[PDB]
Amino acid sequence: SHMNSVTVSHAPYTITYHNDWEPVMSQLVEFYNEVASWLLRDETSPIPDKFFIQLKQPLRNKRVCVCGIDPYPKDGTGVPFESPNFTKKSIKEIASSISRLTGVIDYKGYNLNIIDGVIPWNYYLSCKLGETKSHAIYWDKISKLLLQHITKHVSVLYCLGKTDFSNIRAKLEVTTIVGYHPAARDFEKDRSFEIINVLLELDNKAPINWAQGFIY
Amino acid sequence: SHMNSVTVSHAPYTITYHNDWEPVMSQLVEFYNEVASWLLRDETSPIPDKFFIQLKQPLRNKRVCVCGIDPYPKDGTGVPFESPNFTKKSIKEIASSISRLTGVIDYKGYNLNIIDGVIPWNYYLSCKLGETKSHAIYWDKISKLLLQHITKHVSVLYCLGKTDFSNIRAKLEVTTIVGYHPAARDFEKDRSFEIINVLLELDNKAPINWAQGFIY
Ligand SMILES: [Cl-]
Ligand SMILES: [Cl-]
């Protein structure tokens, strides 16, 4: 069924997750306990209470995963790409791409987490405040475990960042696009890489309406 | 440089390979020796002398990998998908897709191994005469090793067969399309999946001219 379950750890001490994540929660508890103490030492983005909040998303209704390597170095919320005040460069560049693709001119913000069929994801679920990929060693196996579970549900995996994702062993056993980082210099590639996965969808599944992410 | 090197085994006893495959040849010798005796027991497709002939292809000039799970159950040549007399269903269906995409009406045959930028590949390099995926257990680690090496060179990995490739742990560390099997029942998906990877190319690399495969 569709429900939220619960599991015990140490800081945030309790992880609430949607039913769909069950197959993975036993190993995630094992992995997090042997790692948390090394991890919690630093000021993190997001705060420990927000590490796993994205596990409250169902995967049954997801067909696309938009994956960044890790949360914003500062002001991370626990929801990947989310910037509640729309000041973070990465989500502003995605918004502009979508704006250009769809034809939507006016908007106050953009959020990938409110689009039907889309789960936004952070490969590593944290980093030390102000330092990208700084907690990579701690999430290692957890990261592989959770992306393995996601790619069983979603049809398209869209990774943002070529060098960010350059050395990452991961899943075995679907359609992957390794596009540029949203804040890359030189546009056509960014914008076409988001239009290209609705036609990868067409081969079987329903399209994504990327404009559902716009906040007015 | 660009040259063909040589390595020692036991049946076919000698493996000739292009320079580009060097990083992988030490492990492939280790892996093949501990496996060959179990493998050579059966009548195979292709014959042992043809197992590794596709290692004579450079990878430096390859941007697309078209991957089947293993050679034809009968009449395999050592070159993936190749049917010298154009009677095998899989290559005839690919040819028809290309014919429909390109506009080429008349041809005697089709070969993926004569297209610039394309390396055709068999995940498992053999099978028992008349039985698909029958030598899967023997190639296991070798298969992972060689596809790992290919995907470092190519920009697009195109796998043909959803259930054929359903349970396959593989590479870590690029753009993957898991399309249908060429001999699938119900066409648009087959043909669009081959037109879709030239635009995945466009994001960075030169296009593939699929019509280069036609034999007149
Ligand atoms: Cl984030
Ligand atoms: Cl073959």
Residue numbers in the entry:
A (entry chain A), B (entry chain A): -1 to 171, 174 to 186, 189 to 218
Relevant lines from the article:
UDG:A20 association is essential for assembling of the processive DNA polymerase complex. The overall structure of the vvUDG protein in both crystal forms is similar. vvUDG adopts an α/β fold described as DNA glycosylase fold in the SCOP database that is composed of a parallel β-sheet of 4 strands (order 2134) with 3 layers of α/β/α.
We have determined the crystal structure of recombinant vvUDG by SIRAS phasing in trigonal space group P3221. The structure was refined to an R value of 24.1% (Rfree of 29.9%) at 2.4 Å resolution. The recombinant protein used for crystallization contained an N-terminal His-tag. The asymmetric unit in trigonal space group P3221 contains a dimer (type I) with subunits A and B related by non-crystallographic symmetry two-fold symmetry (rms deviation of 0.06 Å for all Cα atoms between individual subunits). In subunit A an imidazole molecule occupies the active site making interactions with D68 and displaying hydrophobic contacts with F79. The chloride ion (Cl-) in subunit A shows distances of 3.3–3.5 Å to backbone nitrogen atoms of active site residues Y70 and F79 and the ND2 atom of N120. Protein regions at the type I dimer interface only observed in the trigonal crystal form may be involved in the binding of A20.
